Design a protein around this motif. Structure first.
Motif, PDB file in Angstrom:
ATOM      1  N   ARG A  65       0.840  -1.176   0.000  1.00 57.02           N
ATOM      2  CA  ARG A  65       0.000   0.000   0.000  1.00 57.02           C
ATOM      3  C   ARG A  65       0.890   1.245   0.000  1.00 57.02           C
ATOM      4  O   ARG A  65       1.991   1.236   0.533  1.00 57.02           O
ATOM      5  N   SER A  66       0.402   2.327  -0.576  1.00 52.90           N
ATOM      6  CA  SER A  66       1.220   3.522  -0.703  1.00 52.90           C
ATOM      7  C   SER A  66       0.784   4.598   0.279  1.00 52.90           C
ATOM      8  O   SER A  66      -0.404   4.874   0.426  1.00 52.90           O
ATOM      9  N   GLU A 109      -5.689 -11.431   2.818  1.00 52.38           N
ATOM     10  CA  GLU A 109      -4.797 -10.567   2.083  1.00 52.38           C
ATOM     11  C   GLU A 109      -5.387  -9.172   2.058  1.00 52.38           C
ATOM     12  O   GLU A 109      -6.604  -9.009   1.923  1.00 52.38           O
ATOM     13  N   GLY A 110      -4.522  -8.175   2.196  1.00 52.83           N
ATOM     14  CA  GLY A 110      -4.945  -6.791   2.183  1.00 52.83           C
ATOM     15  C   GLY A 110      -5.388  -6.206   3.512  1.00 52.83           C
ATOM     16  O   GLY A 110      -5.478  -4.990   3.648  1.00 52.83           O
ATOM     17  N   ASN A 111      -5.680  -7.051   4.491  1.00 54.37           N
ATOM     18  CA  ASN A 111      -6.112  -6.560   5.788  1.00 54.37           C
ATOM     19  C   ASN A 111      -5.072  -5.651   6.412  1.00 54.37           C
ATOM     20  O   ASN A 111      -3.880  -5.845   6.228  1.00 54.37           O
ATOM     21  N   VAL A 112      -5.528  -4.649   7.151  1.00 55.40           N
ATOM     22  CA  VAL A 112      -4.615  -3.756   7.833  1.00 55.40           C
ATOM     23  C   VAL A 112      -4.954  -3.524   9.280  1.00 55.40           C
ATOM     24  O   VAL A 112      -6.084  -3.229   9.623  1.00 55.40           O
ATOM     25  N   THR A 113      -3.957  -3.613  10.136  1.00 50.10           N
ATOM     26  CA  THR A 113      -4.140  -3.185  11.494  1.00 50.10           C
ATOM     27  C   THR A 113      -3.520  -1.810  11.527  1.00 50.10           C
ATOM     28  O   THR A 113      -2.316  -1.678  11.338  1.00 50.10           O
ATOM     29  N   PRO A 114      -4.344  -0.778  11.693  1.00 48.40           N
ATOM     30  CA  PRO A 114      -3.845   0.585  11.727  1.00 48.40           C
ATOM     31  C   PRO A 114      -2.981   0.821  12.911  1.00 48.40           C
ATOM     32  O   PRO A 114      -3.129   0.186  13.950  1.00 48.40           O
ATOM     33  N   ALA A 115      -2.095   1.779  12.729  1.00 43.33           N
ATOM     34  CA  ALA A 115      -1.086   2.123  13.692  1.00 43.33           C
ATOM     35  C   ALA A 115      -1.601   2.361  15.101  1.00 43.33           C
ATOM     36  O   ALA A 115      -2.558   3.100  15.323  1.00 43.33           O
ATOM     37  N   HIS A 116      -0.893   1.765  16.048  1.00 38.43           N
ATOM     38  CA  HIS A 116      -1.207   1.867  17.453  1.00 38.43           C
ATOM     39  C   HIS A 116       0.020   1.460  18.232  1.00 38.43           C
ATOM     40  O   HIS A 116       1.002   1.023  17.633  1.00 38.43           O
ATOM     41  N   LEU A 134      -0.008  -8.459   2.801  1.00 34.07           N
ATOM     42  CA  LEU A 134       0.215  -8.025   1.436  1.00 34.07           C
ATOM     43  C   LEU A 134      -0.964  -8.250   0.515  1.00 34.07           C
ATOM     44  O   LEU A 134      -1.692  -9.237   0.618  1.00 34.07           O
ATOM     45  N   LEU A 135      -1.132  -7.301  -0.393  1.00 30.63           N
ATOM     46  CA  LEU A 135      -2.191  -7.361  -1.359  1.00 30.63           C
ATOM     47  C   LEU A 135      -1.936  -8.557  -2.211  1.00 30.63           C
ATOM     48  O   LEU A 135      -0.814  -8.775  -2.668  1.00 30.63           O
ATOM     49  N   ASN A 136      -2.978  -9.345  -2.412  1.00 34.23           N
ATOM     50  CA  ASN A 136      -2.879 -10.483  -3.284  1.00 34.23           C
ATOM     51  C   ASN A 136      -1.817 -11.509  -2.850  1.00 34.23           C
ATOM     52  O   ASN A 136      -1.238 -12.199  -3.686  1.00 34.23           O
ATOM     53  N   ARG A 180       3.636  -6.593   5.972  1.00 32.33           N
ATOM     54  CA  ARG A 180       4.446  -5.391   5.978  1.00 32.33           C
ATOM     55  C   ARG A 180       4.218  -4.706   7.310  1.00 32.33           C
ATOM     56  O   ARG A 180       3.097  -4.427   7.686  1.00 32.33           O
ATOM     57  N   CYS A 181       5.300  -4.455   8.022  1.00 27.60           N
ATOM     58  CA  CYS A 181       5.217  -3.881   9.342  1.00 27.60           C
ATOM     59  C   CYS A 181       5.861  -2.516   9.325  1.00 27.60           C
ATOM     60  O   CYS A 181       7.028  -2.388   8.971  1.00 27.60           O
ATOM     61  N   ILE A 182       5.094  -1.490   9.671  1.00 22.74           N
ATOM     62  CA  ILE A 182       5.633  -0.141   9.733  1.00 22.74           C
ATOM     63  C   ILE A 182       5.620   0.343  11.166  1.00 22.74           C
ATOM     64  O   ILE A 182       4.570   0.383  11.804  1.00 22.74           O
TER      65      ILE A 182
END
Ligand SMILES: O=C(O)CCC(=O)C(=O)O
Ligand SMILES: O=C(O)CCC(=O)C(=O)O
Ligand SMILES: [Fe+2]
Ligand SMILES: [Fe+2]
Lengths: 332, 332
Positions: free
Chosen positions: A19-20, A178-185, A270-272, A201-203
């Motif tokens: 994701r961008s 796939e594509g799921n996101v845990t928003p920042a916390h 990750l997407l897909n 992907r971990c930010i």
């Protein structure tokens, strides 16, 4: 640059699956567990990806079929959502913010039920998304127990010992689409994050970026989550989000991410890339014993001031006005 | 409308002696000590002027000559200033705000020295201004002690008793030149303000006007004083000063103003009215035992949060930034 899979099976992922976002990031180091540098990093509460701990070696074979056959007949918490974002919220705090309307719902079900739901959505080309998140407990089956026992307790216990951390409070099982996101916390525990299936992907953002991430109020159900929508950041409300800078990485089967207490983390499947499986390891932090204070200490302080005011005023919703009265014309 | 002096000696003062300000005010009630209404007012911590307590009956004869002859040879604190405004500042806190440069200085001297200084300024048409402010203690002379003993302890002790207040902490003697002003501030004690010579215009604002008066930070030497210059209010920094509303009154010889704890007060010696003499009576408030919380309780809370942060962070100057980080994007 994406790592190559052993056996010339090609790149494990590519850019198009990421994701961008609006901010830059630097890589989190990937190191061997034997490398003194990893040890300095953890010691200093900075993230690092360990590539060879074998922490959950036995879990690498896990997939839905094996789990369905062996994880028992206990209940599993499943979140459902209409967006790719699974913002966490604390049901206990829902009373005090009647106007909060969650984007995702929690449903208790049997593992086979979760699997079936995953199957139905696929087949029906639905847009619904699910995320299973459930602490591993006694109801799991024999084989699983075998696996769990086969984790590298040797290594992680030493880690717990060296860092004077507290007890293992839990291990969360996360299975997501796939594509799921845990928003920042941020979490108030030390975490060894063990990736098992798929890629995530971990930010991460260090504690001293509090000013940039704007966490909801302590008494709000989204306590500890950032208020900023990373997909569409609102720089008027949250101007410092324009200064945020991340440490990022992609973990795969076998990797372990050390997410140090108080560090912000944003996590995406990750997407897909198919479903993901992860198991985390949460330890209570070491005890509070010197100036200058560390960022996370300041964060602690702020949390406590909010909690105290809450109690003292008798209504958390009174917390903001008091703080505003406190600083306007005086400290701002 | 100014009261007439007994014996057709005319108006005790007139409008032209009052300084002009930007806000409206209402009169504080003047009542007899026997009037149940006074008693309700004090009970409820609202100001009232008592006209007949005889609290400092023996002090009514005091003037400079009598005091010089009898007040002893102890030291007296004298503030000197180049403006009519005598902003109070706490020397103990001066270290922590190196950039604070006081407008008035304190000088220790003998009563006769103060008197002489007053004489020299008069004769030399100087613009310097003085304000003597000194707690009455053992060094005072016999006659004074006689006078002090002759105060209506009977009445004030009952007051202390009825209101469950704490002990008398002190009695300040204030002798000041015409035109002198004590800028608005609040005191953490209950105060019976006994006017003896001259007239003082007293402007009070209740605790719930905190948002309008913008007190300096707790750790600043001007802790408890408002930051607003009443002579030239800066509505950009302090916009709510445009909503402030006072209770005002002029006290004369024989009157006693009850200035309840946490109430803001601004005090001015009438222009061209000659020197003023007052004696206050400061009692520690009653003990902290119910919602909803009273304004002064909220004020207490805020003070404490500032003090705690100070200590916890190890540098009071770090208090503001933390508070700002706490609310921006989160509670404001
Ligand atoms: O993997 C995820 O989606 C969330 C994991 C997480 O936030 C944590 O372990 O603290
Ligand atoms: O009379 C004055 O100038 C100041 C008195 C005062 O502020 C007090 O008694 O609290
Ligand atoms: Fe987390
Ligand atoms: Fe005062």
């Amino acid at each position: 640059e994406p790592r190559e899979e052993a056996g010339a099976l090609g790149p494990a992922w590519d850019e198009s699956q990421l994701r961008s976002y609006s901010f830059p990031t630097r890589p989190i180091p990937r190191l061997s567990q034997s490398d003194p540098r990893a040890e300095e990093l953890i010691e200093n509460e900075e993230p690092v990806v360990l590539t060879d701990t074998n922490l959950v070696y036995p879990a690498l074979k896990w997939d839905l079929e094996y789990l369905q056959e062996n994880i028992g007949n206990g209940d599993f918490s499943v979140y459902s959502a209409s967006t790719h974002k699974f913002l966490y919220y604390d049901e206990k705090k829902m009373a005090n913010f009647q106007n909060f309307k969650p984007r995702s719902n929690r449903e208790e079900m049997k593992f086979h039920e979760f699997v079936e739901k995953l199957q139905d959505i696929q087949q029906r080309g639905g847009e619904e998304r699910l995320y299973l998140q459930q602490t591993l407990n006694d109801t799991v089956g024999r084989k699983i127990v075998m696996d769990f026992l086969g984790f590298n307790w040797n290594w992680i216990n030493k880690q717990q010992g060296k860092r004077g951390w507290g007890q293992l409070t839990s291990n969360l099982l996360l299975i997501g689409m796939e594509g799921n996101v845990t928003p920042a916390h941020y979490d108030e525990q030390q975490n060894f994050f063990a990736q098992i299936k798929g890629y995530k992907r971990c930010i991460l953002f260090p504690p001293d970026q509090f000013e940039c991430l704007y966490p909801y109020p302590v008494h709000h159900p989204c306590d500890r989550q950032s208020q900023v929508d990373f997909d569409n950041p609102d720089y008027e409300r949250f101007p410092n989000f324009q200064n945020v800078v991340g440490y990022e990485t992609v973990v795969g089967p076998g990797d372990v991410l050390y997410i140090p207490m108080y560090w912000w983390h944003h996590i995406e499947s990750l997407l897909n890339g198919g479903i993901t499986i992860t198991v985390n390891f949460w330890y209570k932090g070491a005890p509070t014993p010197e100036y200058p204070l560390k960022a996370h200490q300041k964060v602690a302080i702020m949390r406590n001031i909010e909690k105290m005011l809450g109690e003292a005023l008798g209504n958390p919703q009174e917390v903001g006005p008091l703080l505003n009265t406190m600083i306007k014309g005086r400290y701002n």
